[PDB]
Amino acid sequence: YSDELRQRLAARLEALKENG
């Protein structure tokens, strides 16, 4: 995966968890 690419996937999760 390499460190950076994983954190990118986290950034998506972040947007979704805002509301609910």
**Closest C-alpha among 17, 20, 19 to residue 9:** 17
Q: Which amino acid is residue 19, in one-letter code?
A: N
Return phi, psi of residue 10, to 5°: -70, -30
Q: How long a stretch of residues is the chain?
A: 20
Rg (CA), the chain: 9
CA distance 17 to 20: 5
Our CA dihedral for 8, 14, 15, 18, rounded to 10 degrees, sits at: 180
b/e code 1-20 from CB counts within 10 Å (16+ = b): eeeeeeeeeeeeeeeeeeee
Most distant CA pair in the chain: distance in Å? 29
